[PDB]
Design a protein around this ligand. Structure first.
Ligand code: PTY
Ligand code: NAG
Ligand code: NAG
Ligand code: NAG
Ligand code: CA
Ligand code: CA
Ligand code: CA
Ligand code: CA
Ligand code: CA
Ligand code: MG
Ligand code: MG
Lengths: 33, 172
């Protein structure tokens, strides 16, 4: 999930998709595929 | 008659990491403040001492936080969507108090490279595109601005609350 300026932090599976719900683009920014 | 505070900020980005700012503010037709410098050392001055030292230093602090957050947002749109540099952005914003006593009218318009880009609509505290050219940049920038308390309600509050009290206190 995104909060103000959080997206300047490096992506994090834990922070973004386990502690919070992540959308597909946030997941892709973790996978870097 | 129409009492107003206008603020102007022009931000010249050589690349995503370096910006030169130049801005000023006016109460009616009277120039009251100037702002100028690189992101690393931006000077902010009240040309007359409208605010006492403590209160001025608090204003200056909020303005410096704002500039770092504004730069952050520009860097984030680049990292997420790619911007073409160099680019210049102009923000023109203010509050206008009608003499009859209706609610202050406020605005915050952003232009990029001299063209209209997005602007704030204070009724529901939402940003809209001013350009009709669609693009991933505009879409993403609006998504970010419309996503957060900071860039919606706190921004509205600066215009409708902070700016309006400053007009009422310092003209009179
Ligand atoms: C009113 C009395 C004040 C005293 C008089 C002022 C003295 C003026 C002196 C300098 C000359 C003026 C030039 C600078 C303009 C300053 C604007 C500051 C507004 C500000 O701090 O906004 C805060 C929100 O910021 C944010 O939301 C941060 C980011 C905002 C985004 C802006 C849009 C840019 C779009 C860029 C995107 C990417 C582009 C892609 C190409 C909210 O205000 P507050 O913190 O005071 O809280 C209020 C609630 N409590
Ligand atoms: C006010 O600020 C803008 C900076 O973009 C500038 O174009 C205009 O010249 C400034 N006014 C003065 C008196 O410096
Ligand atoms: C803004 O204009 C500059 C200088 O003309 C150009 O190199 C750059 O691509 C432009 N950037 C935009 C429109 O984001
Ligand atoms: C807006 O910011 C967060 C939402 O993520 C929350 O902590 C805060 O309470 C919200 N603002 C208000 C005034 O409810
Ligand atoms: Ca998050
Ligand atoms: Ca995120
Ligand atoms: Ca992310
Ligand atoms: Ca979190
Ligand atoms: Ca993202
Ligand atoms: Mg955890
Ligand atoms: Mg992305």
């Amino acid at each position: 999930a995104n909060s103000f300026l959080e997206e300047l932090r490096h992506s994090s599976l834990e922070r973004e998709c386990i502690e919070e719900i992540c959308d597909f683009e946030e997941a892709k920014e973790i996978f870097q595929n | 008659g129409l009492q107003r505070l206008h603020m102007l900020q022009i931000s010249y980005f050589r690349d995503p990491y370096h910006v030169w700012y130049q801005g000023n503010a006016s109460l009616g037709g009277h120039l009251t403040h100037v702002l100028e410098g690189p992101d690393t050392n931006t000077t902010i001055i009240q040309l007359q001492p409208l605010q006492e030292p403590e209160s001025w230093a608090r204003t200056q602090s909020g303005l410096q936080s704002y500039l770092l957050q504004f730069h952050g947002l520009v860097r984030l749109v680049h990292q997420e969507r790619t911007l073409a540099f160099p680019l210049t952005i102009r923000c023109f914003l203010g509050c206008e108090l009608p003499p009859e006593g209706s609610r202050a009218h406020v605005f915050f318009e952003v232009a990029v490279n001299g063209s209209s880009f997005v602007s704030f609509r204070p009724e529901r505290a939402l940003w809209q595109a001013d350009t009709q050219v669609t693009s991933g940049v505009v879409t993403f920038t609006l998504q970010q601005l419309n996503a957060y308390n900071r860039t919606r309600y706190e921004l509205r509050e600066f215009l409708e609350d902070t700016c309006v009290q400053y007009v009422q206190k310092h003209i009179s």
